[PDB]
Amino acid sequence: PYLTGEWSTKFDYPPMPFDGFLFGSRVMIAKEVKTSPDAKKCIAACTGVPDDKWEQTYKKPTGGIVTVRSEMGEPIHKIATRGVMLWKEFDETIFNLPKNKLVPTLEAKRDYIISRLNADFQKPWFATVNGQARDLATMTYEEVAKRLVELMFIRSTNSWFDVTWRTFTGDFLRRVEERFTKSKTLSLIQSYSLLDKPDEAIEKVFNAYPAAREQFLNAQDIDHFLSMCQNPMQKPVPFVPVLDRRFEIFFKKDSLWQSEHLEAVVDQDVQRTCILHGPVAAQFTKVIDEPIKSIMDGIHDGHIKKLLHQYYGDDESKIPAVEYFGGESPVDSAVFKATSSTDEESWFKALAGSEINWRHASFLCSFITQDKMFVSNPIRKVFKPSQGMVVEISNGNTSSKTVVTLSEPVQG
Amino acid sequence: NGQVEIQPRANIQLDFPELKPYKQVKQIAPAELEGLLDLERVIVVTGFAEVGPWGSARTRWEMEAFGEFSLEGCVEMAWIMGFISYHNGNLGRPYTGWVDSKTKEPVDDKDVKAKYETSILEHSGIRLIEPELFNG
Amino acid sequence: PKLIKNKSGKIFVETKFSKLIGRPPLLVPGMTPCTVSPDFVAATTNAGYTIELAGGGYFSAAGMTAAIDSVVSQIEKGSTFGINLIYVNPFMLQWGIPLIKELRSKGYPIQFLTIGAGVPSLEVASEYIETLGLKYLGLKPG
């Protein structure tokens, strides 16, 4: 109805056709999209809502979609997962307070926040040992290292999800060795590549410094850990290390990649993650893993079928045919002579000819193709009009035999 | 054709008494003692401290027993005497650790001795009386 | 709307946009995280439909250059694609607009640039239109 312009008639307006369409949410379950399988199933589960009811996302889930606020306060449409619902609850109970009220509320609600992060969100509370909520000040160095490995090393692929996270863990082990060493000594982790099997490196480090296995973190090392959790030249840590004024930043930063990398989420659970999807477009996102070619060809072929039926009598012989389709901006024997004042556009329009064929492209296409690159049309630059140029065309009516000859004064 | 070494950082310990396995502890006192004493009439010291010419109990013990400070003792004396202070934040790069109290320059635990031990020893213990400490 | 066909007999929904780009008037917009994948961009372009590589998944010119090189190595000769940049990310624009200019000067098949989350000012838009050497400019008014 938007292609034909009839969409506006219901509003008592003249038809207003449009030039094209874009489909975002619709192709989020395409076979070639990197979205994780469980995320594709969650997207498909979203039933959607008709346009007249979409605005019921600011207040509650509708069609599986809700509206939450980003770091800057901009609205975002996301799937109403457990993590997103926690996001919304925090938006309306913590983040909307004034700066002076924020800290006491975090202190008063600390246990609830920690439980909710550990249960529902893609960034859990870091200081949690065997299900028991703690604080960095109440964990041993071995426990910190083990939690780092648990949250940063992927066992399925047996690798560190990000090399920067391996650098983080290696730096922490290096600070452990610094704290419990008693004199000049060689570091046990000479290269961070030794962390590629983290358990062995941890066992080595904490065998050489057994005291660190039953001693809580030094206050100076708590500060160091939290400072290196803020290193801009590193991927944001996948956890919340502390509750303080920066809790919103710790909670919301880097929130979109987890849906395509569920192997690096706590339990490979989509419900912890954040997925962007539209309330109204969700009504058509049903079939999982349908190739993008199929989805786009389906839309285009439906348009062609409807147009054929409505405006061509279901007769494809009615369709006009050109040699090639494209290159059109939205805005038998001849002789041509160039001058200083000749305008380039009309000169090239005359040289190209009225029919769409090789001559047309030769004289009107703005770019040609190299091995894979696009470069300015050499033919046009060679035929750029200037005083003295004389162009002779013969057989312009039979493209297969047309010959365009350019003559210029040489030696008189 | 075109190693990494680790420096020590001070880790001050409280030095609670070492508790040994019950078997060894039982081998010390007479076997008849079990149940013999009214433990509500036995007095025990559970904590102690001091402020003296050599700082706390820890630093005074180190000077009394060994005649010299360890890295922990030197760092504690530097902190007590105000030579060094703790900093955590921007210093442009982010820094967490000790800094010089007068110049705010960073200080590593390894360098604390070389920077401050002569001053620490010169201004501790029995020494010439300093009018600045006793109202002129 | 109209229907047209070429010598192969392929039918096109003829439209001002489709007439310009020689391809169906349907495109995949820049989406972070989905269009960040160079595999998905190449797959959509090899299917015959316009797509914008999302610049919101990249944090340096080197990384985006590697992603564009991957897309180029995957798409067939003669194909092209677009780039989407966020206007509320001053850093991205600072490192991305010069990158697009350099790549276009190299002849990279970047057909267009789309600006999301804001419309530039007339002066910036003029800078883009003149310098970047693109076929057309995409804007997303709100």
PDB file of N, CA, C and O in Angstrom, chain C residues 54-103:
ATOM      1  N   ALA C  54      27.614  -1.688   9.409  1.00  0.00           N
ATOM      2  CA  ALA C  54      27.414  -0.853  10.587  1.00  0.00           C
ATOM      3  C   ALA C  54      28.759  -0.425  11.159  1.00  0.00           C
ATOM      4  O   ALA C  54      29.567  -1.268  11.565  1.00  0.00           O
ATOM      5  N   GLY C  55      28.996   0.883  11.194  1.00  0.00           N
ATOM      6  CA  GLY C  55      30.191   1.415  11.814  1.00  0.00           C
ATOM      7  C   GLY C  55      30.148   1.476  13.323  1.00  0.00           C
ATOM      8  O   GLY C  55      31.169   1.779  13.946  1.00  0.00           O
ATOM      9  N   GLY C  56      28.994   1.197  13.924  1.00  0.00           N
ATOM     10  CA  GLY C  56      28.858   1.189  15.363  1.00  0.00           C
ATOM     11  C   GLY C  56      29.487   0.004  16.052  1.00  0.00           C
ATOM     12  O   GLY C  56      29.579  -0.013  17.282  1.00  0.00           O
ATOM     13  N   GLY C  57      29.922  -0.998  15.290  1.00  0.00           N
ATOM     14  CA  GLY C  57      30.645  -2.128  15.831  1.00  0.00           C
ATOM     15  C   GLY C  57      32.146  -2.038  15.690  1.00  0.00           C
ATOM     16  O   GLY C  57      32.831  -3.049  15.894  1.00  0.00           O
ATOM     17  N   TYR C  58      32.644  -0.868  15.319  1.00  0.00           N
ATOM     18  CA  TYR C  58      34.061  -0.707  15.079  1.00  0.00           C
ATOM     19  C   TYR C  58      34.577   0.470  15.849  1.00  0.00           C
ATOM     20  O   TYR C  58      33.873   1.457  16.007  1.00  0.00           O
ATOM     21  N   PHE C  59      35.812   0.379  16.321  1.00  0.00           N
ATOM     22  CA  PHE C  59      36.348   1.415  17.187  1.00  0.00           C
ATOM     23  C   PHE C  59      37.646   2.018  16.710  1.00  0.00           C
ATOM     24  O   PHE C  59      38.256   2.784  17.431  1.00  0.00           O
ATOM     25  N   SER C  60      38.066   1.698  15.494  1.00  0.00           N
ATOM     26  CA  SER C  60      39.268   2.276  14.923  1.00  0.00           C
ATOM     27  C   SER C  60      39.174   2.203  13.427  1.00  0.00           C
ATOM     28  O   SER C  60      38.379   1.436  12.898  1.00  0.00           O
ATOM     29  N   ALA C  61      40.004   2.963  12.726  1.00  0.00           N
ATOM     30  CA  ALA C  61      40.031   2.862  11.272  1.00  0.00           C
ATOM     31  C   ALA C  61      40.611   1.530  10.814  1.00  0.00           C
ATOM     32  O   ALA C  61      40.199   1.008   9.774  1.00  0.00           O
ATOM     33  N   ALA C  62      41.560   0.970  11.564  1.00  0.00           N
ATOM     34  CA  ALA C  62      42.179  -0.290  11.161  1.00  0.00           C
ATOM     35  C   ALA C  62      41.170  -1.433  11.172  1.00  0.00           C
ATOM     36  O   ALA C  62      41.118  -2.242  10.238  1.00  0.00           O
ATOM     37  N   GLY C  63      40.322  -1.478  12.202  1.00  0.00           N
ATOM     38  CA  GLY C  63      39.374  -2.570  12.328  1.00  0.00           C
ATOM     39  C   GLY C  63      38.307  -2.495  11.268  1.00  0.00           C
ATOM     40  O   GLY C  63      37.947  -3.500  10.678  1.00  0.00           O
ATOM     41  N   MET C  64      37.797  -1.302  11.019  1.00  0.00           N
ATOM     42  CA  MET C  64      36.816  -1.124   9.957  1.00  0.00           C
ATOM     43  C   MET C  64      37.433  -1.393   8.593  1.00  0.00           C
ATOM     44  O   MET C  64      36.767  -1.921   7.700  1.00  0.00           O
ATOM     45  N   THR C  65      38.704  -1.033   8.410  1.00  0.00           N
ATOM     46  CA  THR C  65      39.386  -1.346   7.160  1.00  0.00           C
ATOM     47  C   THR C  65      39.469  -2.852   6.956  1.00  0.00           C
ATOM     48  O   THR C  65      39.243  -3.353   5.850  1.00  0.00           O
ATOM     49  N   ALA C  66      39.745  -3.610   8.003  1.00  0.00           N
ATOM     50  CA  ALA C  66      39.809  -5.052   7.875  1.00  0.00           C
ATOM     51  C   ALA C  66      38.448  -5.652   7.581  1.00  0.00           C
ATOM     52  O   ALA C  66      38.355  -6.653   6.887  1.00  0.00           O
ATOM     53  N   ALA C  67      37.396  -5.062   8.129  1.00  0.00           N
ATOM     54  CA  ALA C  67      36.051  -5.561   7.906  1.00  0.00           C
ATOM     55  C   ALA C  67      35.596  -5.243   6.497  1.00  0.00           C
ATOM     56  O   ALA C  67      34.935  -6.036   5.867  1.00  0.00           O
ATOM     57  N   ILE C  68      35.968  -4.084   5.994  1.00  0.00           N
ATOM     58  CA  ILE C  68      35.629  -3.720   4.622  1.00  0.00           C
ATOM     59  C   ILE C  68      36.418  -4.572   3.639  1.00  0.00           C
ATOM     60  O   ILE C  68      35.900  -4.973   2.590  1.00  0.00           O
ATOM     61  N   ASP C  69      37.682  -4.859   3.954  1.00  0.00           N
ATOM     62  CA  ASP C  69      38.477  -5.726   3.093  1.00  0.00           C
ATOM     63  C   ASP C  69      37.900  -7.133   3.050  1.00  0.00           C
ATOM     64  O   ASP C  69      37.881  -7.769   1.992  1.00  0.00           O
ATOM     65  N   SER C  70      37.426  -7.638   4.190  1.00  0.00           N
ATOM     66  CA  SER C  70      36.769  -8.941   4.199  1.00  0.00           C
ATOM     67  C   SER C  70      35.531  -8.930   3.311  1.00  0.00           C
ATOM     68  O   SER C  70      35.326  -9.835   2.488  1.00  0.00           O
ATOM     69  N   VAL C  71      34.699  -7.894   3.449  1.00  0.00           N
ATOM     70  CA  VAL C  71      33.499  -7.795   2.623  1.00  0.00           C
ATOM     71  C   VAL C  71      33.876  -7.771   1.147  1.00  0.00           C
ATOM     72  O   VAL C  71      33.271  -8.466   0.323  1.00  0.00           O
ATOM     73  N   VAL C  72      34.888  -6.978   0.793  1.00  0.00           N
ATOM     74  CA  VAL C  72      35.304  -6.878  -0.601  1.00  0.00           C
ATOM     75  C   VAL C  72      35.791  -8.227  -1.108  1.00  0.00           C
ATOM     76  O   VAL C  72      35.484  -8.628  -2.237  1.00  0.00           O
ATOM     77  N   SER C  73      36.558  -8.948  -0.290  1.00  0.00           N
ATOM     78  CA  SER C  73      37.062 -10.248  -0.714  1.00  0.00           C
ATOM     79  C   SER C  73      35.940 -11.268  -0.851  1.00  0.00           C
ATOM     80  O   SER C  73      36.095 -12.255  -1.578  1.00  0.00           O
ATOM     81  N   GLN C  74      34.809 -11.054  -0.176  1.00  0.00           N
ATOM     82  CA  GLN C  74      33.707 -12.007  -0.278  1.00  0.00           C
ATOM     83  C   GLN C  74      32.721 -11.688  -1.398  1.00  0.00           C
ATOM     84  O   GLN C  74      32.141 -12.617  -1.972  1.00  0.00           O
ATOM     85  N   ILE C  75      32.510 -10.416  -1.734  1.00  0.00           N
ATOM     86  CA  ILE C  75      31.512 -10.066  -2.741  1.00  0.00           C
ATOM     87  C   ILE C  75      32.089 -10.278  -4.134  1.00  0.00           C
ATOM     88  O   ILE C  75      33.308 -10.269  -4.340  1.00  0.00           O
ATOM     89  N   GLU C  76      31.199 -10.465  -5.103  1.00  0.00           N
ATOM     90  CA  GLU C  76      31.605 -10.702  -6.480  1.00  0.00           C
ATOM     91  C   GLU C  76      32.064  -9.407  -7.139  1.00  0.00           C
ATOM     92  O   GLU C  76      31.687  -8.306  -6.731  1.00  0.00           O
ATOM     93  N   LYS C  77      32.888  -9.555  -8.169  1.00  0.00           N
ATOM     94  CA  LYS C  77      33.413  -8.405  -8.889  1.00  0.00           C
ATOM     95  C   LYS C  77      32.278  -7.558  -9.453  1.00  0.00           C
ATOM     96  O   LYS C  77      31.334  -8.074 -10.056  1.00  0.00           O
ATOM     97  N   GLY C  78      32.376  -6.245  -9.253  1.00  0.00           N
ATOM     98  CA  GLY C  78      31.386  -5.302  -9.721  1.00  0.00           C
ATOM     99  C   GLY C  78      30.348  -4.904  -8.690  1.00  0.00           C
ATOM    100  O   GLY C  78      29.585  -3.963  -8.936  1.00  0.00           O
ATOM    101  N   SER C  79      30.297  -5.588  -7.550  1.00  0.00           N
ATOM    102  CA  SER C  79      29.312  -5.291  -6.524  1.00  0.00           C
ATOM    103  C   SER C  79      29.776  -4.127  -5.648  1.00  0.00           C
ATOM    104  O   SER C  79      30.949  -3.750  -5.633  1.00  0.00           O
ATOM    105  N   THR C  80      28.865  -3.596  -4.851  1.00  0.00           N
ATOM    106  CA  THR C  80      29.181  -2.471  -3.995  1.00  0.00           C
ATOM    107  C   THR C  80      28.365  -2.585  -2.740  1.00  0.00           C
ATOM    108  O   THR C  80      27.545  -3.475  -2.629  1.00  0.00           O
ATOM    109  N   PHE C  81      28.581  -1.685  -1.792  1.00  0.00           N
ATOM    110  CA  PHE C  81      27.848  -1.703  -0.540  1.00  0.00           C
ATOM    111  C   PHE C  81      27.984  -0.380   0.136  1.00  0.00           C
ATOM    112  O   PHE C  81      28.730   0.449  -0.312  1.00  0.00           O
ATOM    113  N   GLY C  82      27.285  -0.186   1.242  1.00  0.00           N
ATOM    114  CA  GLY C  82      27.281   1.082   1.930  1.00  0.00           C
ATOM    115  C   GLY C  82      27.826   0.969   3.346  1.00  0.00           C
ATOM    116  O   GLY C  82      28.078  -0.124   3.862  1.00  0.00           O
ATOM    117  N   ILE C  83      28.008   2.131   3.967  1.00  0.00           N
ATOM    118  CA  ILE C  83      28.488   2.237   5.339  1.00  0.00           C
ATOM    119  C   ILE C  83      27.525   3.115   6.122  1.00  0.00           C
ATOM    120  O   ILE C  83      27.050   4.137   5.616  1.00  0.00           O
ATOM    121  N   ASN C  84      27.232   2.711   7.353  1.00  0.00           N
ATOM    122  CA  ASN C  84      26.381   3.468   8.259  1.00  0.00           C
ATOM    123  C   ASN C  84      27.228   4.023   9.396  1.00  0.00           C
ATOM    124  O   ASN C  84      27.972   3.275  10.038  1.00  0.00           O
ATOM    125  N   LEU C  85      27.114   5.326   9.645  1.00  0.00           N
ATOM    126  CA  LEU C  85      27.841   5.972  10.727  1.00  0.00           C
ATOM    127  C   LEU C  85      26.872   6.658  11.679  1.00  0.00           C
ATOM    128  O   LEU C  85      25.856   7.220  11.264  1.00  0.00           O
ATOM    129  N   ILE C  86      27.214   6.664  12.960  1.00  0.00           N
ATOM    130  CA  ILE C  86      26.383   7.288  13.968  1.00  0.00           C
ATOM    131  C   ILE C  86      26.794   8.731  14.211  1.00  0.00           C
ATOM    132  O   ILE C  86      27.955   9.002  14.471  1.00  0.00           O
ATOM    133  N   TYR C  87      25.852   9.649  14.164  1.00  0.00           N
ATOM    134  CA  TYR C  87      26.188  11.064  14.292  1.00  0.00           C
ATOM    135  C   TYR C  87      26.424  11.503  15.729  1.00  0.00           C
ATOM    136  O   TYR C  87      27.037  12.536  15.958  1.00  0.00           O
ATOM    137  N   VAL C  88      25.956  10.717  16.687  1.00  0.00           N
ATOM    138  CA  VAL C  88      26.146  11.028  18.091  1.00  0.00           C
ATOM    139  C   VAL C  88      27.424  10.402  18.602  1.00  0.00           C
ATOM    140  O   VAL C  88      27.666  10.409  19.803  1.00  0.00           O
ATOM    141  N   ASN C  89      28.230   9.830  17.716  1.00  0.00           N
ATOM    142  CA  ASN C  89      29.530   9.311  18.101  1.00  0.00           C
ATOM    143  C   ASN C  89      30.569  10.180  17.447  1.00  0.00           C
ATOM    144  O   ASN C  89      31.045   9.869  16.360  1.00  0.00           O
ATOM    145  N   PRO C  90      30.959  11.270  18.106  1.00  0.00           N
ATOM    146  CA  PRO C  90      31.905  12.162  17.446  1.00  0.00           C
ATOM    147  C   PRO C  90      33.193  11.461  17.093  1.00  0.00           C
ATOM    148  O   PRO C  90      33.827  11.830  16.112  1.00  0.00           O
ATOM    149  N   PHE C  91      33.601  10.483  17.882  1.00  0.00           N
ATOM    150  CA  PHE C  91      34.860   9.816  17.637  1.00  0.00           C
ATOM    151  C   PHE C  91      34.792   9.020  16.365  1.00  0.00           C
ATOM    152  O   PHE C  91      35.713   9.038  15.573  1.00  0.00           O
ATOM    153  N   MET C  92      33.692   8.312  16.177  1.00  0.00           N
ATOM    154  CA  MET C  92      33.497   7.507  15.001  1.00  0.00           C
ATOM    155  C   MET C  92      33.565   8.351  13.762  1.00  0.00           C
ATOM    156  O   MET C  92      34.156   7.957  12.777  1.00  0.00           O
ATOM    157  N   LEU C  93      32.937   9.509  13.802  1.00  0.00           N
ATOM    158  CA  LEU C  93      32.915  10.358  12.642  1.00  0.00           C
ATOM    159  C   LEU C  93      34.299  10.863  12.390  1.00  0.00           C
ATOM    160  O   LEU C  93      34.714  11.002  11.252  1.00  0.00           O
ATOM    161  N   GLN C  94      35.021  11.136  13.459  1.00  0.00           N
ATOM    162  CA  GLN C  94      36.372  11.660  13.318  1.00  0.00           C
ATOM    163  C   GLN C  94      37.288  10.640  12.661  1.00  0.00           C
ATOM    164  O   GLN C  94      38.113  10.996  11.811  1.00  0.00           O
ATOM    165  N   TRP C  95      37.166   9.369  13.038  1.00  0.00           N
ATOM    166  CA  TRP C  95      38.013   8.359  12.412  1.00  0.00           C
ATOM    167  C   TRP C  95      37.378   7.701  11.192  1.00  0.00           C
ATOM    168  O   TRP C  95      38.099   7.070  10.412  1.00  0.00           O
ATOM    169  N   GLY C  96      36.073   7.859  10.972  1.00  0.00           N
ATOM    170  CA  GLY C  96      35.417   7.173   9.879  1.00  0.00           C
ATOM    171  C   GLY C  96      35.318   7.971   8.596  1.00  0.00           C
ATOM    172  O   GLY C  96      35.549   7.427   7.513  1.00  0.00           O
ATOM    173  N   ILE C  97      34.970   9.256   8.691  1.00  0.00           N
ATOM    174  CA  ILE C  97      34.837  10.068   7.480  1.00  0.00           C
ATOM    175  C   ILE C  97      36.156  10.141   6.721  1.00  0.00           C
ATOM    176  O   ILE C  97      36.156   9.907   5.499  1.00  0.00           O
ATOM    177  N   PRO C  98      37.298  10.436   7.353  1.00  0.00           N
ATOM    178  CA  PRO C  98      38.569  10.351   6.614  1.00  0.00           C
ATOM    179  C   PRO C  98      38.835   8.971   6.044  1.00  0.00           C
ATOM    180  O   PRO C  98      39.399   8.856   4.949  1.00  0.00           O
ATOM    181  N   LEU C  99      38.452   7.913   6.762  1.00  0.00           N
ATOM    182  CA  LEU C  99      38.670   6.566   6.248  1.00  0.00           C
ATOM    183  C   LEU C  99      37.873   6.336   4.972  1.00  0.00           C
ATOM    184  O   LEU C  99      38.389   5.768   4.003  1.00  0.00           O
ATOM    185  N   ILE C 100      36.609   6.759   4.958  1.00  0.00           N
ATOM    186  CA  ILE C 100      35.794   6.605   3.758  1.00  0.00           C
ATOM    187  C   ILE C 100      36.381   7.417   2.616  1.00  0.00           C
ATOM    188  O   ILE C 100      36.425   6.958   1.469  1.00  0.00           O
ATOM    189  N   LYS C 101      36.835   8.638   2.903  1.00  0.00           N
ATOM    190  CA  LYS C 101      37.453   9.448   1.856  1.00  0.00           C
ATOM    191  C   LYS C 101      38.664   8.738   1.263  1.00  0.00           C
ATOM    192  O   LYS C 101      38.812   8.651   0.037  1.00  0.00           O
ATOM    193  N   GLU C 102      39.536   8.208   2.123  1.00  0.00           N
ATOM    194  CA  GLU C 102      40.739   7.533   1.649  1.00  0.00           C
ATOM    195  C   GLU C 102      40.386   6.298   0.828  1.00  0.00           C
ATOM    196  O   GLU C 102      40.951   6.066  -0.247  1.00  0.00           O
ATOM    197  N   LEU C 103      39.444   5.489   1.320  1.00  0.00           N
ATOM    198  CA  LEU C 103      39.083   4.266   0.613  1.00  0.00           C
ATOM    199  C   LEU C 103      38.452   4.573  -0.738  1.00  0.00           C
ATOM    200  O   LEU C 103      38.733   3.892  -1.730  1.00  0.00           O
TER     201      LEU C 103
END
